Design an enzyme around this catalytic site. Sequence first.
Site, PDB file in Angstrom:
ATOM      1  N   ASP A  40      -6.386  10.587  10.098  1.00 27.46           N
ATOM      2  CA  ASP A  40      -5.084  10.495  10.775  1.00 27.46           C
ATOM      3  C   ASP A  40      -5.244   9.869  12.184  1.00 27.46           C
ATOM      4  O   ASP A  40      -6.270   9.990  12.845  1.00 27.46           O
ATOM      5  CB  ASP A  40      -4.529  11.936  10.895  1.00 27.46           C
ATOM      6  N   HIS A  53      -4.107   0.573  10.770  1.00 31.61           N
ATOM      7  CA  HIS A  53      -4.635   0.714   9.416  1.00 31.61           C
ATOM      8  C   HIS A  53      -5.793  -0.233   9.158  1.00 31.61           C
ATOM      9  O   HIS A  53      -6.799   0.129   8.552  1.00 31.61           O
ATOM     10  CB  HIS A  53      -3.556   0.581   8.340  1.00 31.61           C
ATOM     11  N   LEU A  59     -24.641   8.714  -2.273  1.00 32.90           N
ATOM     12  CA  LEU A  59     -23.317   9.286  -1.803  1.00 32.90           C
ATOM     13  C   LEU A  59     -22.230   8.912  -2.759  1.00 32.90           C
ATOM     14  O   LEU A  59     -22.081   7.715  -3.149  1.00 32.90           O
ATOM     15  CB  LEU A  59     -23.060   8.699  -0.461  1.00 32.90           C
ATOM     16  N   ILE A 114      -2.936  20.677   6.852  1.00 38.29           N
ATOM     17  CA  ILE A 114      -3.654  20.004   5.735  1.00 38.29           C
ATOM     18  C   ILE A 114      -2.856  19.027   4.965  1.00 38.29           C
ATOM     19  O   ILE A 114      -3.429  18.195   4.213  1.00 38.29           O
ATOM     20  CB  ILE A 114      -4.315  21.050   4.824  1.00 38.29           C
TER      21      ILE A 114
HETATM   22  C1  LIG Z   1     -10.740   1.294   1.058  1.00 33.25           C
HETATM   23  C2  LIG Z   1      -9.434   1.876   1.476  1.00 33.25           C
HETATM   24  C3  LIG Z   1      -8.926   3.147   0.822  1.00 33.25           C
HETATM   25  C4  LIG Z   1      -8.713   1.244   2.573  1.00 33.25           C
HETATM   26  C5  LIG Z   1      -7.391   1.835   3.080  1.00 33.25           C
HETATM   27  C6  LIG Z   1      -7.707   2.843   4.218  1.00 33.25           C
HETATM   28  C7  LIG Z   1      -6.491   3.191   4.972  1.00 33.25           C
HETATM   29  C8  LIG Z   1      -5.931   2.219   6.046  1.00 33.25           C
HETATM   30  C9  LIG Z   1      -5.829   4.479   4.741  1.00 33.25           C
HETATM   31  C10 LIG Z   1      -4.577   4.880   5.514  1.00 33.25           C
HETATM   32  C11 LIG Z   1      -4.935   6.279   5.984  1.00 33.25           C
HETATM   33  C12 LIG Z   1      -3.721   6.946   6.559  1.00 33.25           C
HETATM   34  C13 LIG Z   1      -2.433   7.087   5.754  1.00 33.25           C
HETATM   35  C14 LIG Z   1      -3.893   7.491   7.898  1.00 33.25           C
HETATM   36  C15 LIG Z   1      -2.828   8.240   8.507  1.00 33.25           C
HETATM   37  O1  LIG Z   1      -2.719   7.775   9.828  1.00 33.25           O
HETATM   38  P1  LIG Z   1      -1.199   7.730  10.236  1.00 33.25           P
HETATM   39  O2  LIG Z   1      -0.541   6.403   9.721  1.00 33.25           O
HETATM   40  O3  LIG Z   1      -0.489   8.971   9.839  1.00 33.25           O
HETATM   41  O4  LIG Z   1      -1.342   7.672  11.857  1.00 33.25           O
HETATM   42  P2  LIG Z   1      -0.254   8.367  12.924  1.00 33.25           P
HETATM   43  O5  LIG Z   1      -0.166   9.839  12.546  1.00 33.25           O
HETATM   44  O6  LIG Z   1      -0.956   8.139  14.339  1.00 33.25           O
HETATM   45  O7  LIG Z   1       1.021   7.518  12.749  1.00 33.25           O
HETATM   46 MG   LIG Z   2      -0.270  10.769  10.749  1.00 32.21          MG
END
Ligand SMILES: CC(C)=CCC/C(C)=C/CC/C(C)=C/COP(=O)(O)OP(=O)(O)O
Ligand SMILES: [Mg+2]
Lengths: 235, 235
Positions: free
Chosen positions: A15, A32, A126, A190
């Site tokens: 996050d 991202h 892994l 979570i």
């Molecule tokens: C190989 C592969 C799976 C590549 C993709 C990886 C990727 C960019 C996943 C997104 C992860 C995600 C939803 C994070 C949440 O941060 P958020 O958007 O909630 O951040 P914020 O809470 O600060 O807005």
């Molecule tokens: Mg978030």
Amino acid sequence: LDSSNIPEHIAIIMDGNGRWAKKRKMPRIKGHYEGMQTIKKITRIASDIGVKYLTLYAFSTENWSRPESEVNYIMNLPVNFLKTFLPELIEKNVKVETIGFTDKLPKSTIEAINNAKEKTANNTGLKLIFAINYGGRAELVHSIKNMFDELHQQGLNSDIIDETYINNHLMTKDYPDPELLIRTSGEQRISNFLIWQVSYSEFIFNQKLWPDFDEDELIKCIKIYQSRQRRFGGL
Amino acid sequence: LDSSNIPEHIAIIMDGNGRWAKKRKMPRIKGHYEGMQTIKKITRIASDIGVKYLTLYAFSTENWSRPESEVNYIMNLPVNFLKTFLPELIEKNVKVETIGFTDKLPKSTIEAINNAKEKTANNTGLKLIFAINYGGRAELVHSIKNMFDELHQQGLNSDIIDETYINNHLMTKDYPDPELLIRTSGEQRISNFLIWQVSYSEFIFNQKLWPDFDEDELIKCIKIYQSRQRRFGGL
Ligand SMILES: CC(C)=CCC/C(C)=C/CC/C(C)=C/COP(=O)(O)OP(=O)(O)O
Ligand SMILES: [Mg+2]
Ligand SMILES: CC(C)=CCC/C(C)=C/CC/C(C)=C/COP(=O)(O)OP(=O)(O)O
Ligand SMILES: [Mg+2]
């Protein structure tokens, strides 16, 4: 680190990508992109210290509510990640896996992930597990539907169902439960991640935004984990 | 406090009773006695500020591993609690409930809790819910066995099962999911408490041991909760 107590399975909620970009007055997708790159950093250190399973929360069943441009960008980023990093994953003996309802992904993403799965299927290092279109409640709903059919088709009653039987019908049936769940950005929740499997996991709520989470931070979380006293309901 | 944003349902893991007694070189049971008394303090403030549901983790399905003397003491303490506090619960319009496999309790405890349930059955104020011989995995196992029979006996297929249908077959079917989960003592884990229901709960890991957790501390946790930004997978 106590090299005799490396956790076998670390799960991470990645996050803070959006906030990382907004601090820099950049669009959320840039965060991202950078979070995708940070996966490579963390995969390297987890593999080099001998973590057995690393589960990353890439896209939840609730994240479909987000703007389509953002959903499409996240769903496309595995193609970019594998194009550049698959050779190193094969050489490092990493095995690529997923959990979630991965049939909902773009076809080009399904193809790239299937290729990576096939090219690392016999690797013994892994297990790098992407939770993509994944949520613990939907995982349980699906597993329950499958157990209902399986028992009826095997001429069995529900008396067989115990906690163990459920473990063995989840998407995570081949993984131990995580000893450690890390969430970045300082949120303390979570959010539907691995809700059955984290019943007794240690939690660490790391304050760095995901793109700033690095090897040193991973090692600091493992050292904190090694100081926790786990009791599993006993003394 | 923002009086328009009092959480409807607070769940609390009441941890630290043992350590509280050991700091004072007292037996662990003394800490449980004092934790029983602290329930009364917290029930009063939660009722006076208008919390609708308060779920307390009194004894888990894993706590049977503990010494028999400690298990017996905890399982007997509801009798003492209700003898002295039931009149005030009736006058404060509190409704007493339980979740868990409460048939496993001592018979004198079952009788005292049944009496308290009957004497408060029509009360419309705070629902004070004791989770006694309760665990989220066993709750799900039991609910799954019941859904398997119910669908077969109603001539239904598993296609009806969705997240909503599961909510309505849990021990907590009549309660909203908690907005807030508090655990005392500084441990950071959920230990099998409400694992389905806390999917999107805010967590607060309060450092006081349970017998030192008081009204002021409850109000401080609610104020922290009111500063959290909940997103439920969206922006
Ligand atoms: C190989 C592969 C799976 C590549 C993709 C990886 C990727 C960019 C996943 C997104 C992860 C995600 C939803 C994070 C949440 O941060 P958020 O958007 O909630 O951040 P914020 O809470 O600060 O807005
Ligand atoms: Mg978030
Ligand atoms: C009305 C009613 C339900 C009365 C009984 C209330 C009561 C005493 C519940 C016990 C709660 C419990 C197992 C706390 C855990 O602290 P811990 O023993 O784990 O403390 P530690 O981690 O410091 O050893
Ligand atoms: Mg404890």
